[PDB]
Design an enzyme around this catalytic site. Structure first.
Site, PDB file in Angstrom:
ATOM      1  N   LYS B  39       0.736  -1.180   0.030  1.00 43.16           N
ATOM      2  CA  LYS B  39       0.245  -0.098  -0.098  1.00 43.16           C
ATOM      3  C   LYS B  39       0.806   1.274  -0.040  1.00 43.16           C
ATOM      4  CE  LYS B  39      -0.909  -0.548   5.072  1.00 43.16           C
ATOM      5  NZ  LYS B  39      -0.075   0.748   5.535  1.00 43.16           N
ATOM      6  N   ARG B 138      -7.941  -0.160  16.445  1.00 47.20           N
ATOM      7  CA  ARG B 138      -8.441   0.452  15.379  1.00 47.20           C
ATOM      8  C   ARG B 138      -9.538   0.105  14.827  1.00 47.20           C
ATOM      9  NH1 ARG B 138      -3.977  -1.597  10.862  1.00 47.20           N
ATOM     10  NH2 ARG B 138      -3.094   0.226  11.432  1.00 47.20           N
ATOM     11  N   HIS B 168      -3.942  -7.880  14.181  1.00 48.19           N
ATOM     12  CA  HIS B 168      -2.791  -7.204  13.922  1.00 48.19           C
ATOM     13  C   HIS B 168      -2.172  -6.778  15.469  1.00 48.19           C
ATOM     14  CE1 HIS B 168      -0.156  -4.817  11.789  1.00 48.19           C
ATOM     15  NE2 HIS B 168      -0.091  -3.640  12.454  1.00 48.19           N
ATOM     16  N   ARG B 221       1.782 -11.138   6.999  1.00 48.59           N
ATOM     17  CA  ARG B 221       1.762  -9.859   5.868  1.00 48.59           C
ATOM     18  C   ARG B 221       3.008  -8.935   6.128  1.00 48.59           C
ATOM     19  NH1 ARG B 221      -2.686  -9.968   9.820  1.00 48.59           N
ATOM     20  NH2 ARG B 221      -1.872  -8.030  10.436  1.00 48.59           N
ATOM     21  N   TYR B 266      15.777  31.529   4.188  1.00 45.59           N
ATOM     22  CA  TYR B 266      14.686  32.307   4.691  1.00 45.59           C
ATOM     23  C   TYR B 266      14.684  32.481   6.226  1.00 45.59           C
ATOM     24  CZ  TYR B 266      11.804  31.399   0.624  1.00 45.59           C
ATOM     25  OH  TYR B 266      11.423  31.468  -0.728  1.00 45.59           O
ATOM     26  N   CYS B 312      14.181  24.900   1.445  1.00 47.56           N
ATOM     27  CA  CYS B 312      13.073  25.721   0.677  1.00 47.56           C
ATOM     28  C   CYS B 312      12.276  24.582   0.101  1.00 47.56           C
ATOM     29  CB  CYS B 312      13.708  26.472  -0.578  1.00 47.56           C
ATOM     30  SG  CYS B 312      14.687  27.888  -0.135  1.00 47.56           S
ATOM     31  N   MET B 313      10.949  25.296  -0.397  1.00 50.26           N
ATOM     32  CA  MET B 313       9.800  24.359  -0.901  1.00 50.26           C
ATOM     33  C   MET B 313      10.623  23.564  -2.015  1.00 50.26           C
ATOM     34  SD  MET B 313       6.186  25.566  -2.535  1.00 50.26           S
ATOM     35  CE  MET B 313       5.623  25.982  -1.134  1.00 50.26           C
ATOM     36  N   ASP B 314      11.172  24.198  -2.890  1.00 47.43           N
ATOM     37  CA  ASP B 314      12.028  23.484  -3.915  1.00 47.43           C
ATOM     38  C   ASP B 314      13.484  23.250  -4.001  1.00 47.43           C
ATOM     39  OD1 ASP B 314      10.071  22.599  -5.933  1.00 47.43           O
ATOM     40  OD2 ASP B 314       9.087  24.791  -5.682  1.00 47.43           O
TER      41      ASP B 314
HETATM   42  C1  LIG Z   1      11.870  32.718  -6.485  1.00 44.77           C
HETATM   43  C2  LIG Z   1      10.529  32.858  -5.822  1.00 44.77           C
HETATM   44  N1  LIG Z   1       9.573  33.915  -6.103  1.00 44.77           N
HETATM   45  C3  LIG Z   1       8.409  33.846  -5.585  1.00 44.77           C
HETATM   46  C4  LIG Z   1       8.112  32.655  -4.395  1.00 44.77           C
HETATM   47  C5  LIG Z   1       6.738  33.044  -3.942  1.00 44.77           C
HETATM   48  O1  LIG Z   1       6.605  33.180  -2.423  1.00 44.77           O
HETATM   49  P1  LIG Z   1       5.494  33.340  -1.362  1.00 44.77           P
HETATM   50  O2  LIG Z   1       4.387  32.194  -1.673  1.00 44.77           O
HETATM   51  O3  LIG Z   1       5.899  33.423  -0.162  1.00 44.77           O
HETATM   52  O4  LIG Z   1       4.571  34.574  -1.996  1.00 44.77           O
HETATM   53  C6  LIG Z   1       8.955  31.598  -4.354  1.00 44.77           C
HETATM   54  C7  LIG Z   1       8.547  30.543  -3.461  1.00 44.77           C
HETATM   55  N2  LIG Z   1       9.497  30.443  -2.218  1.00 44.77           N
HETATM   56  C8  LIG Z   1       9.156  29.351  -1.220  1.00 44.77           C
HETATM   57  C9  LIG Z   1       8.237  29.476  -0.412  1.00 44.77           C
HETATM   58  O5  LIG Z   1       8.393  28.355   0.330  1.00 44.77           O
HETATM   59  N3  LIG Z   1       9.408  27.648  -0.108  1.00 44.77           N
HETATM   60  C10 LIG Z   1       9.953  28.282  -1.301  1.00 44.77           C
HETATM   61  O6  LIG Z   1      10.953  27.868  -2.078  1.00 44.77           O
HETATM   62  C11 LIG Z   1      10.318  31.725  -5.067  1.00 44.77           C
HETATM   63  O7  LIG Z   1      10.873  30.593  -4.897  1.00 44.77           O
HETATM   64  C1  LIG Z   2      -3.390  -5.090   9.146  1.00 42.71           C
HETATM   65  C2  LIG Z   2      -1.877  -4.854   8.566  1.00 42.71           C
HETATM   66  N1  LIG Z   2      -1.122  -5.918   8.502  1.00 42.71           N
HETATM   67  C3  LIG Z   2       0.475  -5.671   8.105  1.00 42.71           C
HETATM   68  C4  LIG Z   2       0.972  -4.706   7.968  1.00 42.71           C
HETATM   69  C5  LIG Z   2       2.317  -4.617   7.438  1.00 42.71           C
HETATM   70  O1  LIG Z   2       3.001  -3.929   8.551  1.00 42.71           O
HETATM   71  P1  LIG Z   2       4.647  -3.830   8.504  1.00 42.71           P
HETATM   72  O2  LIG Z   2       4.960  -2.678   7.607  1.00 42.71           O
HETATM   73  O3  LIG Z   2       5.173  -3.174   9.944  1.00 42.71           O
HETATM   74  O4  LIG Z   2       5.254  -5.018   8.450  1.00 42.71           O
HETATM   75  C6  LIG Z   2      -0.045  -3.257   8.075  1.00 42.71           C
HETATM   76  C7  LIG Z   2       0.576  -2.063   7.916  1.00 42.71           C
HETATM   77  N2  LIG Z   2       0.541  -1.372   9.314  1.00 42.71           N
HETATM   78  C8  LIG Z   2       0.862   0.020   9.409  1.00 42.71           C
HETATM   79  C9  LIG Z   2       2.235   0.516   9.532  1.00 42.71           C
HETATM   80  O5  LIG Z   2       2.312   1.724   9.703  1.00 42.71           O
HETATM   81  N3  LIG Z   2       0.948   2.360   9.520  1.00 42.71           N
HETATM   82  C10 LIG Z   2       0.083   1.207   9.525  1.00 42.71           C
HETATM   83  O6  LIG Z   2      -1.330   1.240   9.270  1.00 42.71           O
HETATM   84  C11 LIG Z   2      -1.378  -3.784   8.480  1.00 42.71           C
HETATM   85  O7  LIG Z   2      -2.040  -2.586   8.736  1.00 42.71           O
END
Ligand SMILES: Cc1ncc(COP(=O)(O)O)c(CNC2CONC2=O)c1O
Ligand SMILES: Cc1ncc(COP(=O)(O)O)c(CNC2CONC2=O)c1O
Lengths: 370, 370
Positions: B39, B138, B168, B221, B266, B312-314
């Site tokens: 999943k 759950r 589980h 599982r 930032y 940063c975001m990117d």
């Molecule tokens: C060069 C540049 N100009 C303008 C923006 C727009 O910024 P605001 O959403 O704050 O108006 C960004 C995004 N900058 C961000 C914000 O979060 N992560 C980043 O890389 C950017 O990288």
């Molecule tokens: C019912 C059931 N069986 C087996 C697994 C596989 O588990 P493992 O990855 O740990 O082997 C999961 C995933 N359970 C998780 C793990 O994180 N969040 C969940 O809902 C599950 O929900």
């Protein structure tokens, strides 16, 4: 890949996007343009729809962070200028012409190498915007002289067209303005040694546009504000009421009566103090609802419920106030009665900013638009 | 929506998933079946290509969280049993029949309801698995008699089939085995009142399979371990060599030298203590490289590089201890020289579990396979 067959859902109010954009345009001089930055899938809201909503509010250009994110916009049908905000490999220079995309450049080295594999006098110039680092410290030319040298070079080759020169602020959203002005000084001093100026001279972002309007420039890159989120987080008040465009909901898929002393969640980090009605919500951290959200309270029938126990990959458990059937809608982000959960609220609990909360929202979550 | 035009890539090692699966299959009672839960898009590794890797590894069945995830498996050509681990909204029972999928059922109400829309002799029985809650709280039937009632009902109406029962664990990866033993106990009781059992009787997960190999059951599982990740973080040593299948890289797109006293990122949360080389990498929190990864160190030419300034975001900037041009490979998760960045390390710096780092990596990051 997209969970359409599960009650977990993201509703996006595009009208807000337009309103937030319109209002900002009304505060801009008749000469200042508004480019809507819609990178990272519209901050998790949806690029095309954000762009489309953005346009209807006065937007005349868009900013993205990847080549193909732009192609998607071109493909989506947007015929306005599209500015890619970061550097792009040379191997892909042709793609910039083919889509008439505007690229940012930060090195004299890039242009010279781009100059090659570019026809002598193409009928399709390469639209470059020169980025000047005036304090952000990530990308750009560090010097007025370099900046200028970059210009002289771009000017001396018809195969280019620099429609812009710009820089970005690192502390527009802070109460202390000292660093901000220092960055503005560095920009002025680098424009100062320039004879001509391109059509686009941009320096402001959401934060800048709101708390520093006087800052020079004929174009602004409006981001988060578009989605109604205070750029400052909580520090200051926007110049105008921003309307939130992100809403997240789900529903109970299992209800239960637990006896006292029953552990719930991994590592049984939680243990019933008494008779408790526990709801099971089908949203996990794989959806974006992170584990540190444990303890946070979501909404159902207008009453708050605490996330008890570890959040799972695909679901989490909440303590219901009183008995309830399976089916009641669970509001995780939005209003419900007198209670409302803002992304800022989610953010503060996550010790981050909503910029991140929103992006973190997985594609597995279908987004519905009004 | 996928950034193939950005060097930031997520390399997946399918051979490794196969090997993790075979190891366990041989370590297994051989009177047992291995189901591969894939999943959340293969835990970030890719559902279909993970599944197939688990198949050639010895898997003979699949576990997912959503009906949607299930249909993907069918459309992909998987003909083995596909069990949906959570409840599935009654409205999609006909699809269940359509894709011959096995479903989880945790209430009597549901069963008698699904029966309505089931045709007496549909020649396609509803392959159901009855989940009993024993611990972890759950979903599932709380008491033995409740399951007895559920069982006797399912064996009755004969539009159903009842492929199995299972529960589980919530503390199987914990050193202290108390709570575990308790759940095992309650599940013994449950099966104790049923004078009969179905094709599958499963309780084991990654954790339980590794450290509690003797618990009763004929199918496990297997999840996280088939991806090479210690299902307990670092609390216990796996029972066999797990080989990480995930890998994350990118590359320097910008390089500069800054003079002592310059702010980066930032807020201006970082300033050069002296003269130093700064690199910029095209990966940000929108990719799932969360803001709290600052201070974390990535790999360039086998040397560690600290992430300075805000992520940063990117993109994000790092402190290069050298002088290097643009283009060297940036290793965020994996090996380089003798240094190693593992998902665990990432999880620990993020103050959570690798389960979440993996599912947080965005769709936009292209996943390369072999
Ligand atoms: C060069 C540049 N100009 C303008 C923006 C727009 O910024 P605001 O959403 O704050 O108006 C960004 C995004 N900058 C961000 C914000 O979060 N992560 C980043 O890389 C950017 O990288
Ligand atoms: C019912 C059931 N069986 C087996 C697994 C596989 O588990 P493992 O990855 O740990 O082997 C999961 C995933 N359970 C998780 C793990 O994180 N969040 C969940 O809902 C599950 O929900």
């Amino acid at each position: 890949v997209v969970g359409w067959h599960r009650p977990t859902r993201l509703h996006i109010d595009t009208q807000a996007i337009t309103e937030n954009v319109q209002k900002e345009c009304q505060r801009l001089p008749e000469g200042t343009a508004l480019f809507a930055v819609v990178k990272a899938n519209g901050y998790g809201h949806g690029a095309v729809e954000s762009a489309k909503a953005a346009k209807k509010g006065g937007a005349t250009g868009f900013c993205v962070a990847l080549l193909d994110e732009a192609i998607e916009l071109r493909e989506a049908g947007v015929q306005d200028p599209i500015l890619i905000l970061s550097v792009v490999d040379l191997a892909y220079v042709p793609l910039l012409i083919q889509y008439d995309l505007s690229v940012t450049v930060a090195t004299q080295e890039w242009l010279e190498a781009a100059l090659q594999q570019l026809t002598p006098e193409s009928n399709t110039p390469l639209r470059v915007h020169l980025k000047v680092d005036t304090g952000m410290g990530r990308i750009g030319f560090l010097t007025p002289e370099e900046t200028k040298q970059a210009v002289r070079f771009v000017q001396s080759h018809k195969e280019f067209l620099w429609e812009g020169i710009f820089t970005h602020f690192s502390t527009a959203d802070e109460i202390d303005t000292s660093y901000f002005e220092k960055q503005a000084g560095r920009f002025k001093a680098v424009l100062a040694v320039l004879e001509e100026l391109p059509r686009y001279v941009h320096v402001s972002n959401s934060a800048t546009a709101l708390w520093h309007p006087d800052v020079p420039g004929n174009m602004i890159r409006y981001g988060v504000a578009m989605y109604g989120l205070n750029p400052s987080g909580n520090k200051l008040a926007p110049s105008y009421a921003l309307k939130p465009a992100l809403r997240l909901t789900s529903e109970l898929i299992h209800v239960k009566r637990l006896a006292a002393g029953e552990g719930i969640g991994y590592g049984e980090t939680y243990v019933t103090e008494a008779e408790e009605w526990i709801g099971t919500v089908p949203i996990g951290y794989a959806d974006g609802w992170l584990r540190h959200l444990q303890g946070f309270t979501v909404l159902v029938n207008g009453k708050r419920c605490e996330i008890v126990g570890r959040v799972c990959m695909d679901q989490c458990m909440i303590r219901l106030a009183e008995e309830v059937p399976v089916g009641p809608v669970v509001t995780l982000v939005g209003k419900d009665g007198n209670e409302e959960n803002t992304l800022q609220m989610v953010a503060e609990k996550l010790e981050t900013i909503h910029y991140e909360v929103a992006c973190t929202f997985s594609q597995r979550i279908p987004r519905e638009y009004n």
